[PDB]
Design a protein around this ligand. Structure first.
Ligand code: NI
Ligand code: NI
Ligand code: NI
Ligand code: NI
Lengths: 147, 147
């Protein structure tokens, strides 16, 4: 299975769409994961059954609290993996996302906590984007900065 | 899929049994991968169909050369992963094999080659077993020391 974990990739794709300011719709998942329209619909309904998302009136997709927690954790592993691959392993930049897209599905939280120490409390991926879920991971808390 | 890559796990199980000097039999896979007798027997039949193994006249399994090259590459990834996990990431030794068991299925050859440099030309896993396939990786040559 090229996606490694299909469910986690539907979750991470919906999260991507949210960071991008794009409406999370099935058609976007089909495009980005190279799956047919009906396959996406069936996977999505199975995830709804599983309590990972809701399919709204207008057909837009919404992560549930359960689905959102899991999406965050995958994206956290993804960006920690990219940090590792660039900062420590020295994998060229143009190859790190593809690699991280596999590793995000197999990294334990224990490794993530080690990576947070080894990488010196990283807060962003190599590509500038914030790493989510660090509070839930147990390594950080959030302060407010007033502008 | 808890095996991450089922075929690769069958390959590496068969390979393990050959490292231990025991006979790789359909039965033996079922026990180590906690799989149905039928599931093993079926996957084994399927991998045979795909040029990965041959069932010998006495039922015992032997990897083709295609299958053996793949098993070595998985094992090589496994052991480099375990060395990364202990040496750089600092995950406890008690937990690295189970983590490496997943990561061995998603690591690219490019990452392996970087890991060889980063871990300073490793030749064994953290547990003293030789890393196979480093010549095929392209990073080493072999020489003989006469005893
Ligand atoms: Ni990425
Ligand atoms: Ni992925
Ligand atoms: Ni191991
Ligand atoms: Ni494995």
């Amino acid at each position: 299975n090229e996606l490694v974990d299909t469910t986690e990739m539907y979750l991470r794709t919906i999260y991507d769409l949210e960071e991008e300011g794009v409406t999370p719709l099935r058609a976007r998942i089909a495009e980005r994961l190279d799956q047919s329209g009906p396959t996406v619909s069936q996977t999505v309904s199975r995830m709804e059954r599983d309590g990972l998302l809701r399919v709204a009136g207008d057909r837009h997709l919404e992560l549930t609290e359960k689905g959102r927690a899991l999406a965050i954790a995958v994206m956290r592993k993804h960006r920690l993996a990219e940090r590792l691959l660039v900062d420590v392993i020295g994998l060229p930049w143009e190859e790190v996302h593809a690699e991280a897209c596999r590793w995000e599905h197999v990294m334990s939280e224990d490794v993530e906590r080690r990576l947070v120490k080894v990488l010196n409390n990283p807060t962003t991926s190599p590509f500038g984007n914030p790493i989510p879920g660090l509070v839930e991971l147990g390594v950080a808390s959030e302060n407010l900065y007033f502008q």
